[PDB]
Structures are given as structure tokens and as C-alpha cells.
């Protein structure tokens, strides 16, 4: 599977960041992937036409893709994930379980807050839990992930103003 997965390329096969098709003409990815020059591999080969906040980045694609079975978008969930929920991180798929935020507070050198969630067991890629996108990929330490539920509106807004 993973029909929502996309690759951001630098000139010409310099693979570097992942992205997730959230709507048929829209990708979501992490902020540190802000290159002012990239191409998109979704298969189809596209170009950015708009890029955005300091936590995630929205990319508007030159073409709206017709939802297929090999390429289809994934909905961004408004329900925040609860500890114990099992999810999968792809970008080669690993299984993980949401943890308490204090596991990440106790282990990380910086402050952790609501806009992230804590998860782990045994960039720009997706964390899918109940079949919907709930996070983005930001030693034996738990991972921190962007809590997309707290951003569901900033994307909606950002889409209306670039549509």
C-alpha cells in the first residue's frame, strides 16, 4: 500500500524528504524540508506551485491528481491520538504505539508540548493510526511526532487562501 506517499527530489534523484497527499492537489510535509527548489514524485512527476508556520509545510501541486488506487489522498484526523493507540510509520513500514507525553518529556533535551505526541516501540513521512493521518515524522528513545489534530484548521485556512 501507501498510495498517499510522495517523495521530494532535489536535482535530479537527490531524494530528501517525504510528503503525504492530504487532498488531490495538496501535500503535507515537515518544515525543515523548505527547499525553494524541488520536484515531486507521487506514478506522476510534478512541480511545486505554492509552499507555506514553523511546524509543518503545505505544498500545492501543479496538477490535481485523479484519485486512483495507486495514488489517493489521506484525511487528516481531527481526533488527537490517545496513548495505547497503535500506528504505523512509513517512508519500509514500522509499527509503533502512542505513549504518554511524559515519556518524551523525560527523554528529550527540549520542551515537549501539545503540538507533538510521543510514540515508540521496537522526515516528512506519515504516522497513520486508525486509517487516518495523525502525525508526521518530525538511539533507543521514543520518537516525537507532529500532532496533526492540533493543526487541522491551519491547513484548511491555508488551503482556502491558495485555492
Amino acid at each position, epitope marked *: 500500500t501507501q498510495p498517499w506517499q510522495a517523495a521530494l527530489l532535489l536535482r535530479p534523484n537527490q531524494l530528501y524528504c517525504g510528503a503525504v497527499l492530504v487532498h488531490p492537489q495538496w501535500l503535507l510535509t515537515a518544515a525543515h524540508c523548505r527547499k525553494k527548489v524541488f520536484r515531486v514524485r507521487l506514478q506522476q512527476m510534478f512541480q511545486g506551485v505554492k509552499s507555506i508556520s514553523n511546524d509543518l509545510m503545505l505544498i500545492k501541486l501543479n496538477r490535481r491528481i485523479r484519485p486512483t488506487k495507486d495514488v489517493r489522498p489521506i484525511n487528516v484526523s481531527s481526533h488527537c491520538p*490517545s*496513548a*495505547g493507540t497503535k500506528c504505523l510509520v512509513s517512508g519500509q513500514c514500522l509499527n509503533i504505539s502512542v505513549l*504518554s*507525553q*511524559k*515519556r518524551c*518529556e*523525560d*527523554a*528529550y*533535551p*527540549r*520542551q*515537549i*508540548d*501539545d503540538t507533538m505526541f510521543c510514540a515508540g516501540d521496537k522526515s516528512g513521512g506519515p504516522v497513520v493510526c486508525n486509517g487516518s493521518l495523525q502525525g508526521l515524522v518530525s538511539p533507543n528513545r521514543p520518537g516525537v511526532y507532529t500532532n496533526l489534530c492540533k493543526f487541522t484548521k491551519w491547513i484548511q485556512e491555508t488551503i482556502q487562501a491558495n485555492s
Partner: antibody
Amino acid sequence: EVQLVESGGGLVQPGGSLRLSCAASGFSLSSYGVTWVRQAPGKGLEWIGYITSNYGVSYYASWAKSRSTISRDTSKNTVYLQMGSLRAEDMAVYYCARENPDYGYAYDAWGQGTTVTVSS
Amino acid sequence: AIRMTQSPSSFSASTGDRVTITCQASESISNELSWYQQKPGKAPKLLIYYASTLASGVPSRFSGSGSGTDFTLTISSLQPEDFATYYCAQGFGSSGVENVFGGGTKVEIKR
């Protein structure tokens, strides 16, 4: 034995500063975070904040962030609470307590409590 | 922004009775919930953690239940030395929190 011994609670005049020490014996601050909680006479438990075990990151109650600091001396295995601009509302018994991650960070070992009186 | 609330503020029952007191989280905290007993003039003591596992030395008449937002502490048979105030505390997250503790429930004994 795990033990948290507190010191530094006394009579402070209004607008003064409090400095409190929580000296940990029987365990290492690099393995256990420590919390500060206070209690006014006849009232409930009021969390002030805590400092993590690994990098010593401080988390504060929203009401406490602007005036409080929680810090760690790893060589003395001692945790500190500092507070300025003291008012009547800060008169309280101040406890420190250890967070045990195996019990999901529950507070399993408490200090004896040190009393801070804001008076002139 | 997790808020914890306890109910009732005051609980009176008779010796030997079953006692049930509640605690609620404004958002899900899974089972990261702990219960503390504070006898008069003493530091609080941990009774229950992970919502339902008894700490060493806690009398078996204590038990705790729940997961998510609604939690229960229970005393199967109220003994005199159970006179105290009971607090719950979430250990799910620390950011944007006013207080990790609930307001407490004072247990009073009718004899």
C-alpha cells in the same frame, strides 16, 4: 533507603525571595525527575513543577512560570526551587517528591516538607 | 490543557462501609493516573498508580479503576485509619497544565 530532605523554609517578608533545597539520597537525579508541590493551611495540593531526569528540563504550572525556577545540581544530587516577589498567597508547606517512571511518573517518595511564612 | 476534578469534595460514611470517590480528566490520559492519601499533618503517600495497581504496603481494601477520562478509587471497607484526604494526579503530560492534582476528597468516618 530513598530519602528527600528539604531545607530553606523560613520566615520571608513580602516581596522577598525563597530558596528551597531538596537533597536526594538513595537514588540519582539522572534517573528520577523531581517535582515541587505546595499546600496552604487547610487547602489542597498545588503543583509548582518538576525537572526531568536526563537533561534536567523544567516544566512549570502555568501560574508559576513567570516567577518560579526549578533547577538541579547533579554533583550535590540536589534539586532547588526559587521564587521571587513573594506574597501572602505563597505562604505554604513546600514538598519535593521523586517521579518513578515505572509507576508512570507517580510521586512515590516525598520529602518531609518545609514551611514558608510570608510575614514582616 | 488537562484539568483534573474530583467528586465529592467531602465523603462521610460509617466504619466498614464501601467508599467510592471519583476523578475526571478534561481529556484522555489513558491509565496515567495516581491516587495519593494525605493523613492530617503528613506528606501525601502514593496508594495507586497506572489507575489500578496498588503500591507496596497499601492495604488490599483499596482499589482503583478506569481508563481514559473517568476514574474511581474504592475502599472496600472503611477503617478508622483511612481518615484522610484523597487526591488524584495525572502523569500524562506537563505542558499547559495549571495543576496536575485534583481538588481532593476528604473522607470522614461515622462511628
